[PDB]
Amino acid sequence: LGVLRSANYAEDNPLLEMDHKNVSDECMLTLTKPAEQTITYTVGIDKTLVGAYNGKNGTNYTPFPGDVILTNEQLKLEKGKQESSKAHLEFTYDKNLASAIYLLPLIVKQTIYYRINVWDEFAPAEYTTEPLVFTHIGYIDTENMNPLIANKLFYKLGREPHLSYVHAFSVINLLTATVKYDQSGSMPEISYNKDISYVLGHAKKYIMPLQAQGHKVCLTIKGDGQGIGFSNLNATQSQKLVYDIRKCLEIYGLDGVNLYDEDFSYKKEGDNLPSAANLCNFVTALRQAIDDKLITYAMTEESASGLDQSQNGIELGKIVDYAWTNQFNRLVNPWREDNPFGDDSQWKIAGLEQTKFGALTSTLKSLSQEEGELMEGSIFDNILDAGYMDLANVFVVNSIAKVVAGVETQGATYLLWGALINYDVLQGINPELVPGLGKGGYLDIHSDLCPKDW
């Protein structure tokens, strides 16, 4: 008696994601008792087991009809060991394969039941039009990343026969344009680096495809450190930047703008100081100009004080679609007194419903043991124990970045916290980021999922 396991997957019957390329896995035999003598078993394909599997598990899988190349099919079990040598399975992709989930049973002659998801041209098999239950906002740094990677990241929701695939993000923020003085040194203008220019100049290639798959796409605007920005514009300057932002979203088919309140290098003394009232007047003007296009606000330690109070009757929270902070890998709760994780009252925005606040903005950085405990504690205790459920509606990822050495642990989890709370805990639906594991997945440090091509 023994078990035919996968070498890289703990799932008894692993589900591989085949996006128009081959997929592979290795399996081995684990014997309940150590081998008395050196024996060799052989693994083979038996597609006759499919009908019994679909009856037992309620599924509808058709046996995988593509070419399957098994190498090292003879499993060597040395005396005294319980695990054999590893066989290798290469599932060949071909255009003659329709998009579906297939089954390929591998037997000893127990049994392992490989499931192969053959993707369509836009989404995996069993993709659904069912919308994500929460708003997931993803930054893409156009200096290193292709915005189209959003169209490759999915959530595998549920367990068979109730599997569903949904896009992992619903809003995408493009990093970044900046605000600086104009050539005459009197007016603010938007400045675009070489990367964000090519993205916007080719919005038909990089933006409309995202919008076609349900993504709202916004342009982020930071400062360029010349001391002029969203919170210190006079009447004339405000009308200029409002006009230019309104024009920019119309010109490139953008759904909205993300006001990233950082890097303006505001002076601490002089005649153009930052004020929360100026910010409220500028954003109020922006809202009149762009109508229902999205305005979001990213708060930082460089934000002006007073946003917890109305400014000339204006509450910034009433006129913005979403807000969040740069307090990465930590759940910020500005409405919680005696907060055991730290007082976040500085991040309070007057008029902002909790359901519009990204309490958790995660970033791709390795965390210490303490930092890791702070992240999970702040998330769980605030949303479940303290009862701030409304803080589970918006989740933000500041830069979907490449998974590399030293950030594999955060890479695997920092895009799943919103699905973890909303689906796995608040409902019973298991969530998995796809395409994660395996050669070529988002978590393969030697592969780029959807690389920069300009």
Residue numbers in the entry: 42 to 150, 163 to 507
Extract from the study:
Altogether, our data suggest that human gut microbes employ evolutionary strategies to express distinct ENGases in order to optimally metabolize the same N-glycan substrate in the gastroinstestinal tract.
We found that PUL16 also encodes another putative GH18 endoglycosidase variant, BT1284. However, this protein contains non-conservative substitutions of both acidic residues in the catalytic site, thereby lacking the canonical catalytic DGxxxDxE motif of bona fide ENGases. To better understand their lack of catalytic activity and glycan binding ability, we determined the X-ray crystal structure of B. faecium GH18-like to a maximum resolution of 2.67 Å. Structural surface analysis in the putative glycan binding pocket of this ENGase-like protein, revealed that HM N-glycans do not fit as well as in a bona fide HM endoglycosidases. Together, these data indicate that ENGase(GH18)-like proteins were unable to hydrolyze or bind N-glycans in the assayed conditions, but may they still play a role in the metabolism of N-glycans in HM-PULs from Bacteroidales by some as yet determined mechanism.
